[PDB]
Amino acid sequence: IKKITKAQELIATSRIAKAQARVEAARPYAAEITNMLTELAGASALDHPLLVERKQPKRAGVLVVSSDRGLCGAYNANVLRRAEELFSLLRDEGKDPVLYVVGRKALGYFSFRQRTVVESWTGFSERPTYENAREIADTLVNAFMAGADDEGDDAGADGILGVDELHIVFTEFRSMLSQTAVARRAAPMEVEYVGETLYSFEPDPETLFDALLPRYIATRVYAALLEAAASESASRRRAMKSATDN
């Protein structure tokens, strides 16, 4: 045990180093895609359904990002507590949560709670890759887009019942010592007007902007996954240190 927990603690420290390296490595792409998105938004109409809130919303696609392995001390506990708080907020607002999960621990918790899970992607919380983030973002965005024509309990012409909002519940890695589970709304996004040669767009700014928002959502979900992995590694290091002290 003592040897096992100490070895796990040191391995977790190395994993934190690697996860921080990954988080930093993805920063330039996210920054530059944000710059391009700002440029396109400035020079195009902001009418995308992804960018305008629907009326009388009654559903919300919540993503709960948890860990595959269970040795992390309270990571899953904090994530699920924040998810419950978000569910209470959504119920108060009047929307029925629609649940998407990542990692086996959250699956176990929700199955025990008997709540329904629309889709689960498991097996990569320890080290997510952009393919997983792209798949998750694509599924969530399809669910959200299908939620335009859907009315009340009626799916409308789609036949598929969508969602009127997307939230990501995940653990920010503030520092090597600080981790915190928060729920961040990723869709429908809101436009923020910051005060302060022109870029020649090909073919037109609107098509590029429409094709770029889904990739921006995927990038943000990937950043959330990287933060979740780093936070999980930090929590694992802390739990292993405490256990070795026990």
Partner 1 sequence: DLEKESVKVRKPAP
Partner 2 sequence: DLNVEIVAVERELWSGPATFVFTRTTAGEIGILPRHIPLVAQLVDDAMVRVEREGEDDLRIAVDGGFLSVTEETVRILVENAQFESEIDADAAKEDAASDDERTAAWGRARLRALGQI
Partner 3 sequence: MDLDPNAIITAGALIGGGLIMGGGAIGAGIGDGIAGNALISGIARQPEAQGRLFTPFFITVGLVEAAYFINLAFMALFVFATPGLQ
Query: What are the residues binding partner 1 (CB under 8 A)?
Result: 34, 37-38, 41-42, 46, 51, 86, 89, 167, 182-187, 189-196, 216, 220
Tell which one of 56, 114, 175, 200 touches partner 3 (CB under 8 A): 200
Residue that is written with structure tokens 């240190």 in the block: 241
Distance between terminal CA atoms of the chain? 10
Closest approach, Cβ 198 to partner 3, in A, equals 6
Residue 25 interface partner, choices partner 2, partner 3, partner 1, none, CB cut-off 5-8 Å depending on type: partner 2
Rank residues 165 and 227 by Cβ distance to partner 2 and give the closer one: 227
Dist CA 84 CA 118 (whole Å):
17
Contact 128, 225 (CB under 8 A): yes
Q: How buried is residue 195: exposed, middle or buried, by Cβ count under 10 Å (0-12/13-18/19+)?
A: exposed
Q: Which among 107, 241, 78 is positioned nearest to 171, based on CA atoms? A: 78
Rank residues 98 and 169 by Cβ distance to partner 1 and give the closer one: 169
Angle at 166 between CA 70 and CA 80, to 5 degrees: 25
Rank residues 177 and 198 by Cβ distance to partner 3 and give the closer one: 198
Pick the stretch among 5-13, 111-119, 195-203, 235-243 that binds partner 3 (CB under 8 A): 195-203
Residue 26 interface partner, choices partner 2, partner 1, partner 3, none, CB cut-off 5-8 Å depending on type: partner 2
Q: Can you give the binding site for partner 2, defined by CB under 8 A?
A: 22, 25-26, 28-30, 32-33, 35-36, 39-40, 129-130, 134, 197-203, 207-208, 211-212, 215, 218-219, 222
Angle at 140 between CA 134 and CA 146, to 5 degrees: 130
Which residues are registered as beta bridge partners of 136? Answer: none
Provide the binding-site residues for partner 3, judged by CB under 8 A: 45, 197-198, 200, 203
